[PDB]
């Protein structure tokens, strides 16, 4: 059990000690001093006509016609902490809502350009990125994107969730909160 090559440097005099703090790698005595110097899952079906409705509605209509869209994700994400965080969740910590909401905002801040787009929607993003580059400001997709694509976003997470090497009860909790949002949007059909 030594941070350096296993054998204080054993087998040496006392005037060689050093106890500084740096990176520590064992590597089996550097492969035994280089051989002694070289010998010397899917979302449940509850109210899912919406996906087949907007699947054919993006071929020619792209589900949005106004560039400064009045629908924003900030307000519908703020209502989560004021409506069902104090109602459905058990008493305790609101981490399972607030942490996921912050992660969702950070994911939406960079999800554009890597899938989740259609050809005319790609042209829409291209035109907004040229029109937003005239003042060298960062592109915030919160004020100019609707909440319609949030359902397709949370539907396109699950098959890439298992694409990385990570544990299963994480998937269980992820689909648990996915069930929570679909329960939330069961009655909120106007949004």
């Amino acid at each position: 059990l030594a941070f350096h090559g296993p054998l204080h440097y054993q087998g040496w005099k006392s005037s060689w000690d050093e106890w500084v703090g740096y990176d520590r790698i064992r590597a089996y005595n550097e492969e035994n001093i280089a051989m002694k110097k070289r010998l010397a899952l899917q979302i449940p079906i509850k109210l899912k006509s919406v996906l087949v409705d907007d699947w054919e509605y993006v071929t020619k209509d792209k589900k949005i016609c106004r560039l400064p869209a009045d629908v924003t994700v900030e307000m519908v994400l703020n209502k989560y902490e004021h409506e069902v965080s104090q109602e459905l969740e058990s008493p305790g910590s609101q981490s399972q809502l607030s942490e996921y909401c912050a992660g969702l905002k950070l994911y939406f801040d960079k999800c554009l350009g890597n899938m989740l787009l259609y050809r005319l929607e790609r042209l829409q993003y291209d035109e907004l990125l040229k029109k937003s580059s005239k003042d060298q400001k960062p592109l915030v997709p919160i004020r100019i994107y609707g909440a319609i694509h949030l359902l397709r976003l949370i539907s396109v997470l699950p098959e890439l969730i298992s694409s990385t090497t990570m544990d299963l009860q994480s998937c269980q909790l992820l689909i648990k909160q996915t069930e929570d949002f679909l329960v939330w949007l069961l009655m909120h059909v106007d949004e």
């Binding site: 059990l1 399972q96 990570m166 544990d167």
Partner: protein, 61 residues
């Protein structure tokens, strides 16, 4: 349930670390504090958060 610990593992490849989740991991103990036999890199915040969550869960009973 007995849970007779796991009596530690040497610094070879058997000792595997993967910190992913801090709330509701249900890792049955066997943790260590940082600033197969699965162990998590737990910290003060995660232990204190899950302890508070459990005591707020149990206070109905």
């Amino acid at each position: 349930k007995v849970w007779k610990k796991q009596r530690l593992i040497n610094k070879k490849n058997q000792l595997y670390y993967e910190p992913l989740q801090k709330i509701g991991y249900q890792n049955n103990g066997n943790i260590q504090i940082i600033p197969d036999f699965k162990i998590t890199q737990i910290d003060e915040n995660s232990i204190k958060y899950d302890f508070f969550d459990k005591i707020y869960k149990s206070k109905m009973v």
